[PDB]
C-alpha cells in the first residue's frame, strides 16, 4: 500500500537545520516524495536479490541499488569532492538502538577477534537414485499367508552387525557403530530391538559384574539418544531401570583394580539419567521419581557403599542446589560414616573404598557451592564443622576454587 512518514518529523528535521515557519503543504510535499524514493530503492534492491537468489539478502544490496540510481551509497558520511570515496559501497555502520553510544577503545582490544572460515568448496551428493530419493544425512530424510516382520531382513542383519560392534571387543568397531547409529535415519524402528538387547545385556551384567561391558552398553545408549529420527521417549521406560542398576550395582571384581572403570561407569550413568529426565519433561514423570530413589538409598542406614556412591553421583548430576541443600543436614552423618570405615585394622573391606569415593565427590561439589554462597572465609572453622574429615585438603579445595574464580 502507500505509507508516508509523519509531517511533525519533517518539521523537526527543518528545526535541526534551523529553518523555521515551514509551510504545512511543504511538510506534506517532503513526505510523499521521500516515501516514493524509499519504495523505488526497495524494488531496485529486490531485483538484485532475485538474480542473486540469496533470498535472505546481503549487506550493501541497497548500496548497489543507490549506485544503479546514480546516488551516493555512503551512509553516515558524505564527501563533497567525491574523489576519496566514489560509488564503491561504504558498507554501512554497525550501530543499533540498543547500543549505549559510549565505548572504551581498550575494552574493544580486550575482546578476541573471531576465527576465519575456509574458502567455499564443492561437494557432490545423490539427490535421487534411479528415481528414488536415498535416506542420507545430506538429503532431508483356511491357512492365512505367514506374516513377515515389518523390519527388512537386511536391516535386521545390519542391526545385528551394529550390536556385535557395540559389544566393545574392538574399540574401532564400537566407535564406527556409534557413528552409524547417529547418521542413519533408517536405524529408526529398530530402537525397540536395540533397547531390549541393552536390557538383556544389563540384567546378565547385574548377575556377574562386567563394568567394562557396562560402559560399552552406555556408549550404545548415548548413540541411540543422539539420533533424531528414532523416538527415544517411547522406549525410555525400558532404558531408565537399566541405567539406575548400573550406577548402584555392587562390584563383583576387586574394587581397586576396577575402581577407575567404576567411577567412569557411574559418571556415564548419571549423565544419561539426567538427559532422560530432560527428554519429555513433565511434572512428576521422571525427575521426581529418580530423585526419590537416590535420596531413599542415601538416607537408609547401612546402605551398600557402591549403591550409596551411585545415588550420591545421581543427586549431584540432577541439580547443583540439590547436592548443596542435602549435604548440610547430613554433614555430621557423613563425618560419622568416614570415622566408622576408618575404625578397625583391616583396609581390605570395601567400606573404606566406598567412603573415599563418596567423600571425594562431595568435596569437589562443595567447593563451587561454598564459593557461590559467599566469598571463601573461616576455612579453619569450616574444617572444625567437618571434624577434619578432609582436614587441610578441604581448605585447599576451597582455595583452588577461589584461584579458579580469580583466573576467570
Amino acid at each position: 500500500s502507500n505509507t508516508v512518514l509523519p509531517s511533525e518529523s519533517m518539521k523537526v528535521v527543518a528545526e535541526s537545520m534551523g529553518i523555521a515557519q515551514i509551510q504545512e503543504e511543504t511538510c506534506q510535499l517532503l513526505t510523499d516524495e521521500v516515501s516514493y524514493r524509499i519504495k523505488e530503492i526497495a524494488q531496485d534492491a529486490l531485483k538484485f536479490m532475485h538474480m542473486g537468489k540469496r533470498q535472505k539478502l546481503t549487506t550493501s544490496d541497497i548500496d548497489y541499488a543507490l549506485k544503479l540510481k546514480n546516488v551516493e551509497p555512503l551512509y553516515g558520511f558524505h564527501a563533497q569532492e567525491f574523489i576519496p570515496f566514489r560509488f564503491a559501497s561504504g558498507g554501512g555502520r554497525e550501530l543499533y538502538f540498543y547500543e549505549e553510544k559510549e565505548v572504551d577503545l581498550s575494552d574493544i582490544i580486550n575482546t578476541p577477534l573471531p576465527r576465519v572460515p575456509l574458502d567455499v568448496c564443492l561437494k557432490a551428493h545423490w539427490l535421487s537414485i534411479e528415481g528414488c530419493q536415498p535416506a542420507i544425512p545430506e538429503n532431508p530424510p483356511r491357512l492365512k499367508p505367514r506374516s513377515i516382520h515389518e523390519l527388512s531382513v537386511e536391516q535386521q542383519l545390519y542391526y545385528k552387525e551394529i550390536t556385535e560392534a557395540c559389544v566393545g571387543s574392538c574399540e574401532a568397531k564400537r566407535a564406527e557403530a556409534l557413528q552409524s547409529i547417529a547418521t542413519d535415519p533408517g536405524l529408526y524402528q529398530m530402537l525397540p530391538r536395540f533397547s531390549t538387547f541393552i536390557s538383556e545385556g544389563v540384567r546378565v551384567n547385574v548377575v556377574q559384574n562386567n563394568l567394562a561391558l557396562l560402559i560399552y552398553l552406555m556408549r550404545m545408549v548415548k548413540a541411540l539418544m543422539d539420533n533424531p529420527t528414532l523416538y527415544l521417549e517411547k522406549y525410555v521406560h525400558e532404558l531408565i531401570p537399566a541405567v539406575m542398576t548400573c550406577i548402584v550395582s555392587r562390584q563383583l571384581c576387586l574394587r581397586p583394580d576396577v575402581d577407575n572403570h567404576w567411577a567412569l561407569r557411574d559418571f556415564a550413568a548419571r549423565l544419561v539419567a539426567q538427559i532422560c529426565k530432560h527428554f519429555s519433561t513433565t511434572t512428576n514423570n521422571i525427575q521426581s521419581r529418580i530423585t526419590k530413589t537416590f535420596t531413599k538409598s542415601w538416607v537408609d542406614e547401612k546402605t551398600p557403599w557402591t549403591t550409596r556412591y551411585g545415588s550420591i553421583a545421581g543427586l549431584a548430576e540432577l541439580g547443583h542446589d540439590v547436592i548443596k541443600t542435602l549435604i548440610l543436614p547430613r554433614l555430621q552423618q557423613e563425618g560419622e560414616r568416614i570415622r566408622s570405615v576408618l575404625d578397625g585394622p583391616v583396609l581390605s573391606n570395601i567400606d573404606r573404598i566406598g567412603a573415599d569415593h563418596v567423600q571425594s565427590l562431595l568435596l569437589k561439589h562443595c567447593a563451587p557451592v561454598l564459593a557461590k554462597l559467599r566469598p571463601p572465609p573461616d576455612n579453619q572453622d569450616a574444617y572444625r564443622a567437618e571434624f577434619g574429615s578432609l582436614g587441610p585438603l578441604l581448605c585447599s579445595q576451597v582455595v583452588k576454587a577461589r584461584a579458579q574464580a580469580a583466573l576467570q
Partner: peptide, 25 residues
C-alpha cells in the same frame, strides 16, 4: 488434559526399580 498421549505413556505408569531383578529370587 487427561487425553494427552504422554499421560498414557508407559514410563509414567511404571515403577522402574521394581522391574530390575537386582539379583533377587
Amino acid at each position: 488434559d487427561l487425553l494427552a498421549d504422554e499421560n498414557f505413556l508407559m514410563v509414567t505408569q511404571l515403577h522402574w526399580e521394581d522391574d530390575i531383578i537386582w539379583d533377587g529370587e
